[PDB]
């Protein structure tokens, strides 16, 4: 056991490096930029997970299944956080900032953009804090959603409980009423559940784009996509 403040500071220092992706958009080139970006981020995501304390003490199978299960949710919550103070824009990366209307370039993606933007808008209205963001991204990894994946399982429960306790502690510092602290926690958790659903949609869409030969999918992103 770390303190909740020690835990949150470990999550801060775990944060991955930022990545850059690098003609006007076609369906093809937009998906190329987005898939290129996702693949680079995935590399850093594994290193990030390894810095979440306890994560590397889990069985390797659990480590693998946790990342196969949550990687798209983690990409998406990162995106929402980068975008939180810019209504109508998705800040995918520096030099890849997309207006809502640019979803019209890719078949099916505008529905997903709007869901990502609406979720980002709820985080903005909630005034999601830096400390809360760190906790929720870690909770997503550690299977707050409880997707069905003894010692590794017991450890995992401990780790998720610790990050939940830290989020509760962060919320308590806000000084708002106990009733409002409970409602805030429920709202954040129901938002995580929504991100899971957007992730399922995203996965579907990417598998469709791959199938229709709209975009090639290589390497780590291919590996992670092959698991769904």
């Amino acid at each position: 056991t770390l303190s909740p403040e020690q835990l949150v500071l470990t999550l801060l220092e775990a944060e991955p490096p930022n990545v850059l992706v690098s003609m006007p958009f076609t369906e093809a080139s937009m998906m190329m930029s987005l898939t290129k970006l996702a693949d680079k981020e995935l590399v850093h995501m594994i290193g990030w997970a390894k810095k979440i304390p306890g994560f590397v003490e889990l069985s390797l199978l659990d480590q693998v299944r946790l990342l196969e299960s949550c990687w798209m949710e983690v990409l998406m919550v990162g995106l929402m956080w980068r975008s939180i103070d810019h209504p109508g824009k998705l800040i995918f990366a520096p030099d890849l900032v997309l207006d809502r209307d640019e979803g019209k370039c890719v078949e099916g993606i505008l529905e997903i953009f709007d869901m990502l933007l609406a979720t980002t808008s709820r985080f903005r209205e909630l005034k999601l804090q830096h400390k809360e963001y760190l906790c929720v991204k870690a909770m997503i990894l550690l299977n707050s959603s409880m997707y069905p994946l003894a010692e590794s399982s017991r450890k995992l429960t401990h780790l998720l409980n610790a990050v939940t306790d830290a989020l509760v502690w962060v919320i308590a510092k806000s000084g708002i009423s106990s009733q409002q602290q409970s409602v805030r926690l429920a709202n954040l958790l129901m938002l995580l559940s929504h991100v899971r659903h957007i992730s399922n949609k995203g996965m579907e869409h990417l598998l469709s784009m791959k199938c229709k030969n709209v975009v090639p999918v290589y390497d780590l992103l291919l590996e992670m996509l092959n698991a769904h």
Binding site: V43, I46, K50, L60, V64, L67, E223
Partner: peptide, 11 residues
């Protein structure tokens, strides 16, 4: 080029 398990195991 580097896979999930290699990324998890190494460094």
């Amino acid at each position: 080029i580097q896979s999930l398990i290699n990324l998890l195991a190494d460094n």
